[PDB]
C-alpha cells in the first residue's frame, strides 16, 4: 500500500498491529459482535476516551522534502528513523512546485518562471555540493548548501491516537498545503485499516476541515 | 502465549508488530542473516536504541495492585486497566507462599504470616461486600480493599521501553514480585525477537537476574 | 508557597513555579519573529492561542506540587504520563497511620440501610485492623515490601509532581469533572485554584475557550 | 547568560526552575524525609547519580533561547522529551543569516581546493539562494513556498524547555565526538549553563553517569 505525493514523494505502509477490535479489547480489558463493538468505538470517541486507540499502531515509510519533514517530526508521540545526511551521500531529488501550486496567487511573473527559478538554484546548489564532496569536504559540511526542498526518507511508527492528533493538525486547511497532501495519504491508509475508528473520528472528534470534504 | 505468575497472576501476549528485522529495516530506512544480526549487535553495543522502537507488543497482565502501581510508573507505554469504580471486584488477592520469607528470620512462622495476610484479605473483602449490599457506591466501598487485590491491564510497549523496563525490574533491587513479572516479559520478548534479546543481554542489559 | 487541605488529611501544596502567562506569550511570539508587547496585546494573544488550540506555548510554564492523597486517588492521578513523579515508598518506609475516612456527608444522595456514621465507623474498623496486622508483621521481622500488602487503598501517600501548564489543562479537563470520582475532583479543584493564582490570564482563557469539564 | 556559538548562533538562558536541592527534596519523599543538611544533601545527589536514580532530576527545568542553523535545529529537535517553539518561515520573512564555516572547520581533512575556497563556495550558493528567495517574495510568491530554496545553514530561533534528566541525555548524545561538531559546540554551552545552575548535579553527572567524551576533557 503506497501512495505518491507531490512530484517525487510517497507514503508507504510498512506494518500494522491491530484493527478496530484492538481498541475495543483494550477498552474492555479482555483477550478473546459487530454492532456492539462499533457502538463502543463511537462511544469512546464521543466521550473523549482515547487511550484504547493507543493499542493500534502503524509503521510508515515516508519520502518527503525536509521542510515538510521538519513540520512532521514536531509530533513527539511517535518514533522516527531518518536517512542521515551526515553519512549517506544525498540523491539529486528536490520538490519543485507545479505552476498549479501558484495559480491562485497574484504573481508578477508566470508560475512557469517560479518553477524555473526554483529549479535553477536547486541545480546550482546541488552541483556545489558535489564539487565539495569530490574535493574531499566531509558530507556533513558539504550538505549545508542544500535547499530545504531536498527530499528525505524516514520510518514513522505511531499509534492511532497520535495519528488522529496528527490528522487534526495537518489534514486541515491551515496547515501548509504540501503537508496536507501527506496527511490525506495517512488518512486513506488509516481508513482502510481501521474503518470504524476512522468514521467515528470524523463524526465526533476530528477538528479539521478537509477530511469531511474530500473522500478517504 | 501465557505465563502464570505468583498465585493467580499471569502475563499473556495479545499481539506484536514486527520482529528483529523491523529494527534492521528502520536503521537502514528501506522497504543475509549474518549482516543483519551484526547490525542488531552493532546498534545495541553503541546505544543506538531508536530502531527498536518499531517493534511493539501488547500484553494482557493480571497483577496485584502494588505491582501494577510500580509497573504503571513506566510512562513510555499505553495502559488500559479494569475500573474498580465500575467493576464489582473479584475475590482475588495475592497470598504469598511461605517460601517468600526465605532468608528472613521472623518471630512467627512464615506460614503464620501467610495466614495473617489471608485473614485480612478475608475481612476486608467482607466489609466491602457489607458496604455494597447496604447501598454504598462501589467507588467508595472498595477503598478498604488491600493492596494485594488483583487487577488486570492491557500494556502496549515498544521494544526500547521494554528493554528499559527489564533493566529496572528484571533486577534484584526490584521487588521480587515484579521481578517475576519481568522474567515473563523477558521470556516473551526473547521468543519474538531472539537476535535483539541476545544482543540486549550481551551488550546493554544493566540488571543481574537475566 | 501555597497550601490547600483536601479531604480529612490530604493536601496540595505548590513547591515552585517556572514562568507566568508571559512565558507563553514569549514562546509564541518567536514564531512571528516578535517578542513581548503591551498588556492588551499579550492578553489577546493568550486568548487567541487557547481558542485555536495552539497549546505548545503553554508547555513553557511549569509547576512543582507536593501532594498528600490516598493511594486510590494517587493511582488515578499517576496515569497522567506527561509529568514527573517521586512518591513515598512502601518498600523502604514504615508507613504512617493515616487513612482517608470518608465523612458521613460523602454518602448524601445514596439511601443506605446502614446509617452514614456507621459506614464511616466500619471503614475505620477495617483500616485499624489492617494497620495493626501491618505493624505486627513488621515488628516480627517481615520485610516492609511484604507487610504493606495488607494495607487498604485509602492509605495516604505523598508525592512531588512536576507538570507543565498544557498537561495541567489536560488533567483539569479529565479530573475537574463530575464524571470523575468525588475525591479526585477535590484534588483537581485545588490544582485549578493554584493554576488560577499563578497564571490568571491562561486560566481565564482556558475556562472560556478550552475547558471541557463542568465543575470549574 | 548568553553564550555565542558559531559565527552567528547563541544559547541564552531564559528561565530556570529549581536547583540541586529540588532533586534532593524529590528524592527524600521516598524515605518520608525532607531537606536534611547542606552536605548530606550533596552526598544524596552523588548517590542518586551513582546508582541510576534519574527521576529526581526531572524537577529541575530550564528554558533556553537558541539560535542555530536549521541542520543543527533538526538534530536537536529529535529530542522528544522537551518543549519547543520555533521561528516560522511560513509566517515570517526570514533574515539574511547563514552559518558560514570558518576555514579552520576543515582541520584534519585532506582537501583538493583550499579551505578558503570551500568557505567561499558556500557563501556563493547562500547569496544566490537568498536573492532568489527575495525575488520570489517580491513577485508575490507566498513565504511558505519561497523559502524552500533556502539552504540548511540558514539560522533559526527557538525556545526549548527541558528538564535536567532529558538535558543530561542530550549531553550524553551531543557533547560527544560522534555528534556533528556544530551541535557539539551548542552542547558545550548548554553544559556550561547547567553547571552554573546545578553544580552538584553537574559534577555528579560527569563523574558517575555521563557517557560522552568531550566534557571530561573540555573544561565547563
Ligand atoms: C528498585 C527500584 C526502586 C524505585 N523506588 C522509587 C521510589 O522510591 N519513588 C519513586 O517515585 N519511584 C521509584 N521507582 C520508580 C522509578 O524511579 C521510575 O518511576 C520507574 O522505574 C520508571 O522509570 P523511567 O522513568 O525510566 O521509565 P518511563 O517513565 O517509562 O520512561 C522511560 C525513559 O524515558 C525518559 N523519560 C520519560 N519521561 C521523562 C521525563 N518526563 N523527563 C525526562 N525523561 C523522561 C527516560 O529517559 C526514561 O528512561 C523505583 C524503581 C525501581 C526499579
Ligand atoms: C472519568 C474517567 C474514568 C476513567 N476510567 C478508566 C478505566 O476504566 N481504565 C483505565 O485504564 N483508565 C481510565 N481512566 C484513565 C484514562 O484512561 C487516562 O489514563 C487518564 O485520563 C490520563 O489521560 P491522558 O492519557 O490524556 O493524560 P496523559 O497520559 O498525561 O497524556 C496527556 C496527553 O498526551 C498524549 N499522550 C501521551 N502519551 C501518549 C501515547 N503513548 N500515545 C498517544 N498519545 C499520548 C495524549 O494526547 C494525552 O491527552 C479514566 C479517566 C477518567 C477521567
Ligand atoms: C551521534 C548520533 C548520530 C545519530 N544518527 C541518526 C540517523 O542516522 N538517523 C536518525 O533518524 N536519527 C539519528 N540520531 C538521532 C537519534 O536517533 C535520536 O532520535 C536522538 O538522538 C534522540 O535520542 P533519544 O531518543 O535518547 O532522545 P528523546 O527522543 O528526547 O528521548 C529521551 C529518552 O526518553 C526515552 N524515550 C522517549 N520517547 C520514547 C519512545 N517513543 N520510545 C521509547 N523510549 C522513548 C528513551 O529512554 C530516551 O533515552 C543520531 C543521534 C546522535 C547523537
Ligand atoms: C498550522 C500549524 C502552524 C504551526 N506553527 C508553529 C510555529 O510557528 N512554531 C512552532 O514551533 N511550531 C508550530 N507548529 C507545530 C506545533 O506547535 C506542534 O509542535 C505540532 O503541531 C505537534 O503538536 P502536538 O504537540 O499536539 O503533537 P505531539 O508532540 O505528538 O504531542 C501529542 C500530544 O501529546 C501531548 N504532549 C506531548 N508532549 C508533551 C509535552 N512535553 N508537554 C505537554 N504535553 C505534551 C499533547 O496533548 C499533544 O496533543 C505548527 C503546527 C500547525 C499544525
Ligand atoms: O505549519 C507549521 C508551521 C511551523 N511548524 C514548526 C516546524 C518547525 O520546527 C518550525 C518552523 O516551521 P516553518 O514555518 O519553517 O515551516 O515550526 C510546523 O510544524 N507547522
Ligand atoms: O548526528 C545526527 C545525525 C542525524 N540525526 C537525525 C536528525 C534528522 O532527523 C536525521 C538526519 O539528520 P542528518 O544526518 O541529515 O543531519 O537524523 C541526528 O539527530 N544526529
Ligand atoms: O475514574 C477513573 C477510573 C479508573 N481509572 C484508572 C486508574 C487505575 O489505573 C485504573 C482503575 O481505577 P479504579 O476504577 O479502580 O479507581 O483505571 C482512572 O484514572 N479514573
Ligand atoms: O521498587 C519500586 C519502589 C517504588 N516505586 C514507585 C511506585 C509507586 O508510585 C511508589 C511507591 O511504591 P512502593 O515503594 O510503595 O511499592 O514509587 C517503584 O516503581 N518501584
How do the strands of the widest beta sheet of chain A line up side by side? 1-2-3-5-4
Class by helix and strand content of chain A? alpha+beta
Characterize the main sheet of chain A.
5 strands, antiparallel
Number of domains of chain A: 1
Q: The CATH topology of chain A is what?
A: Gyrase A, domain 2
Estimate the helix proportion of chain A, in percent.
Answer: 40-55%
Q: Can you characterise this structure?
A:
The first copy, chain A, has 216 residues and is an alpha+beta fold. The first copy, chain A, has helices at 20-28, 34-46, 66-72, 111-134, 139-142, 160-170, 177-193, 195-205; strands at 2-5, 9-17, 57-65, 79-82, 151-159. Chain A has a single domain, classed as Gyrase A, domain 2 (2-Layer Sandwich). In chain A, strands 1-2-3-5-4 form a 5-stranded antiparallel beta sheet. In chain A, β1 (2-5) and β2 form a beta hairpin. The relative contact order of chain A is 0.20. At the B-C interface, α3 and α4 of B face α3 and α4 of C. One 2'-deoxyuridine 5'-monophosphate sits between chains A (67, 70-71, 74, 175-176) and D (86, 88-90). One flavin-adenine dinucleotide sits between chains A (74-77, 162, 165, 169-170, 174-175) and C (31, 56, 59, 82, 164, 166-167, 170). Chain A: Belongs to the thymidylate synthase ThyX family. Chain A: This is Flavin-dependent thymidylate synthase. Chain A: Pfam families: Thy1. Chain A: InterPro entries: Thymidylate_synthase_ThyX, Thymidylate_synthase_ThyX_sf.
